[PDB]
């Protein structure tokens, strides 16, 4: 009895907690189990963005058929069409469900373009959605167990912002000053709270998402067991195995839990399991290069494959160029700052090989593609001058105008030299190649055309360029000492492949037969996006949308 529920959800990422709230609202008894001491997983440390074509809040026109054209073009037949149809059907319904039934609120990023402007059915903004700032005081004592935002996602490492509120500051648009004042203002004047916590009471981005979903579970009294890792599946049947529960380790020993209706695997990927990386991912591969929290070690993937579940796309990760920070367990991803004018990426021959403004997935893939030719692109090198340094952030580096060079970071987070030849030698890059790449950059910046990789050639690239810089907001000269290098690792925000599912998130065996009772969502599952990333929110949109469809399918089963 007391270890029996209709639905057991493994993991407390956004997909898992959404599925839990939805299953509850459809009249099912739910338990959530979380491996770690914190709820929210990678979701909590993310931008919290979801990619929702044809959402109700768009300021421009969109349609199911345009969104399907775009997804068919982006996924290149790797994904069952009925899963693409199901995503486009349910993604808007999942966000309307959040907005009508939770304190958490999503709204569109109106100016945030889809990542593939060259594909048919692309939109110039509005499909990407993000959370309103969320009031952590509504969590009471459960605030203590939230996986906390990386301090880089906060203003002066203190004040929570939305991507909308932020973007103004990174692009250097007019009014950014009042925003800084409004944000840090709110924080310091938050007095009853300032006295019990140095954390902003207001959470943004993935922290708003994870706080808001935790709050939804609290209102519904859905139990969430922390420090309670999944270990294995319970099955019945001689001929076709059905999943009837799980074994967890709870208060330090094994406990058998029964799921009458279904088990939802939302435990994330295997990015933190070096053996699984070496088994499946391209070499060289290193878990240390990941931007994720510590735990996604493929625990549910192994257990499901043990009972006949099929896996796909296991050779793909959600790549991001990433930066080692001393003392920090995760590397910092470079999501936006590469689009800024005056920085170039080179291999060990000092040659460019990628549009520096490339979406991060394609950037990672291009590092592996050039590494196979050159032998020196994983890691690769980011180069910029003292004007870039003064003006712009770059992962853990804040603009030099507000933060001077840290001695403890020299040769660890950045290399610095009075000359380009001097810098090249410190980082093992061909000086003549790097000089050639800088000379070409300076020519490109003059007439605003990158003749090799077309940096700034579309509205996605220019979104994170500098508004003030013309003709191309992504291109500026490199010529004012000192010169800086940063080591760009082939990082990730999770693995992309996983258990094969159908349109209702049911796990499929090697014969495409559903494993009765077993669902799988998020990076635990093979990506509905194939080898692509359609726009900001292309991992969390799918996690939450298939979580919604899983709960719906379980309830519709009676």
Ligand X SMILES: Cc1cc2nc3c(=O)[nH]c(=O)nc-3n(C[C@H](O)[C@H](O)[C@H](O)COP(=O)(O)OP(=O)(O)OC[C@H]3O[C@@H](n4cnc5c(N)ncnc54)[C@H](O)[C@@H]3O)c2cc1C
Site residues (vs ligand ANB, CB under 6 A): 47, 49, 153, 163, 166, 205, 335-336, 536-538
296 binds, among ligand ANB, ligand X, Na ion, none (CB under 5 to 8 A by kind): ligand X
Q: Which stretch binds ligand X (CB under 6 A): 6-14, 79-87, 341-349, 382-390?
A: 6-14
Least distance (Å) between residue 413 CB and ligand ANB: 17
247 part of the interface to Na ion, by CB under 5 A: no
Of the two residues 155 and 536, which places its CB atom closer to ligand X in the complex? 536
Least distance (Å) between residue 89 CB and ligand X: 19
CA distance 254 to 249: 5
10 binds, among Na ion, ligand X, ligand ANB, none (CB under 5 to 8 A by kind): ligand X
162 part of the interface to ligand X, by CB under 6 A: no
Beta strand spans in 62-215 (E): 106-108, 128-131, 134-135, 154-155, 159-160, 202-203
CA 93 vs CA 54, 79, 281, 539: distances in Å: 10, 22, 34, 17
Alpha helices, DSSP H, located in 14-80:
14-25, 41-44, 64-75
- Cβ contact 126:59 at 8 Å: yes
Residue 42, marked binder: yes
Q: By CB under 6 A, how many residues form the interface with ligand X?
A: 42
Least distance (Å) between residue 32 CB and ligand X: 9
34 binds, among Na ion, ligand X, ligand ANB, none (CB under 5 to 8 A by kind): ligand X
Among 8, 9, 15, 285, binds ligand X (CB under 6 A): 15
Residue of this chain nearest to ligand ANB (CB atom): 47
CA distance 79 to 81: 6
The token pair that represents 224 in the structure block: 């969430």
Least distance (Å) between residue 293 CB and ligand ANB: 15
393 part of the interface to ligand X, by CB under 6 A: no
Residue with the two structure tokens 């030698």: 425
Residue 230, marked binder: yes
Q: Which stretch binds ligand X (CB under 6 A): 1-9, 18-26, 288-296, 387-395?
A: 288-296
Least distance (Å) between residue 90 CB and ligand ANB: 19
Strand pairing class (230-236; 311-312): unpaired
Among 22, 35, 83, 147, binds Na ion (CB under 5 A): 147
Least distance (Å) between residue 245 CB and ligand X: 14
Torsion angle, CA of 361/365/366/371, rounded to 10 degrees?
Answer: 150
- Binders of ligand X among 46-105, rule CB under 6 A? 46-49
42 part of the interface to ligand X, by CB under 6 A: yes
Of the two residues 385 and 502, which places its CB atom closer to ligand X in the complex? 502
295 part of the interface to Na ion, by CB under 5 A: no
- Binders of ligand X among 208-237, rule CB under 6 A? 229-230
Q: Which long-range contacts (CB under 8 A, 24 or more apart) does 56-59 make?
A: 56/92, 56/96, 57/106, 57/107, 57/108, 57/126, 57/129, 58/108, 58/126, 58/127, 59/108, 59/110, 59/125, 59/126
DSSP state of 17: H
148 binds, among ligand ANB, ligand X, Na ion, none (CB under 5 to 8 A by kind): Na ion
Residue 362, marked binder: no
Residue 34, marked binder: yes
Among 102, 148, 226, 440, binds Na ion (CB under 5 A): 148
Torsion angle, CA of 508/511/514/520, rounded to 10 degrees?
Answer: 0
Sequence-distant (6+) residues with CB within 8 A of 370 are 347, 353, 354, 377, 380
**What sign has the CA pseudo-torsion 206, 208, 214, 219?**
negative
CA distance 393 to 400: 8
CA distance 193 to 166: 23
- Binding positions for Na ion, rule: CB under 5 A: 38, 147-148
Annotated binding-site residues for FAD read 34, 42-43, 47, 49, 230, 296, 299, 523, 539-540
């Amino acid at each position: 009895e007391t270890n029996t529920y209709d639905v057991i959800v493994v993991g407390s990422g956004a997909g898992a907690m959404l599925a839990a709230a939805r299953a509850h609202d459809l009249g099912l008894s739910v338990l959530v189990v979380e491996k770690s001491d914190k709820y929210g997983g990678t979701s909590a440390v993310s931008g919290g963005a979801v990619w929702i074509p044809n959402n109700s809040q768009m300021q421009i026109k969109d349609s199911f058929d345009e969104a399907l054209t775009y997804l068919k073009a982006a996924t290149q037949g790797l994904v069952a069409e009925d899963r693409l149809l199901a995503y486009l059907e349910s993604a808007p319904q999942m966000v309307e469900y959040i907005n009508a039934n939770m304190t958490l609120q999503y709204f569109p990023c109106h100016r945030y373009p889809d990542y593939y402007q060259h594909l048919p059915g692309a939109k110039p903004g509005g499909r990407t959605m993000e959370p309103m700032l969320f009031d952590a005081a509504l969590l009471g004592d459960e605030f203590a167990n939230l996986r906390m935002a990386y301090t880089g996602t906060l203003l002066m490492g203190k004040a929570s912002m939305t991507a909308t509120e932020a973007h103004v500051m990174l692009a250097k648009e007019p009014g950014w000053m009042l925003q800084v004042i409004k944000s840090l203002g709110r924080y310091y004047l938050d007095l009853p709270w300032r006295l019990k916590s140095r954390h902003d009471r207001k959470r943004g981005l993935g922290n708003a998402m994870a706080a808001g979903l935790r709050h939804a579970l609290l209102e519904r009294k859905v139990p969430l067991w922390l420090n309670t890792p999944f270990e294995s599946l319970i099955t019945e049947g001689a001929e076709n195995k059905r999943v009837t529960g799980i074994v967890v380790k709870r208060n330090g020993q094994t406990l058998q839990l029964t799921a009458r209706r279904g088990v939802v695997l939302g435990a994330g990927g295997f990015e933190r399991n070096q053996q699984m990386r070496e088994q499946y991912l391209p070499k060289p591969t290193n878990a240390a290069w990941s931007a994720t929290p510590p735990h996604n070690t493929g625990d549910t993937i192994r257990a499901a494959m043990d009972i006949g579940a099929r896996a796909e796309l296991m050779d793909w990760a959600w790549w991001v160029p990433s930066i080692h920070v001393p003392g920090e367990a995760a590397q910092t991803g470079l999501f936006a700052e590469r689009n800024l004018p005056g920085c170039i990426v080179v291999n060990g021959k000092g040659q460019r090989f990628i549009n520096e403004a490339s979406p991060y997935l394609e950037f990672g893939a291009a590092m592996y593609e050039n590494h196979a030719r050159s032998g020196s692109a994983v890691p690769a090198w980011l180069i910029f001058d003292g004007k870039f340094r003064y003006n712009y952030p770059m992962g853990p580096l804040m603009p030099g105008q507000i933060q001077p060079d840290r001695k403890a970071w020299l040769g660890k987070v950045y290399w610095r030299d009075d000359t380009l030849e001097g810098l090249a030698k410190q980082i093992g890059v061909d000086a003549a190649g790097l000089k050639q790449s800088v000379e070409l950059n300076n020519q490109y910046a003059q007439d605003g055309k990158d003749r090799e990789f077309d940096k700034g050639g579309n509205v996605f690239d220019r979104y994170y360029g500098d508004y003030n810089v013309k003709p191309n907001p992504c291109l500026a000269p490199i010529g004012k000492p000192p010169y800086y290098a940063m080591r760009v690792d082939a990082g990730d925000i999770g693995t992309k492949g996983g258990l094969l599912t159908d349109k209702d998130a049911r796990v499929l065996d090697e014969s495409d037969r559903p494993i009765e009772g077993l669902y799988c969502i998020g990076n635990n599952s093979a990506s509905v996006m194939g080898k692509a990333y359609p726009g900001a929110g292309g991992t969390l949109g799918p996690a939450m949308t298939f979580g919604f469809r899983a709960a719906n399918h379980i309830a519709a089963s009676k």
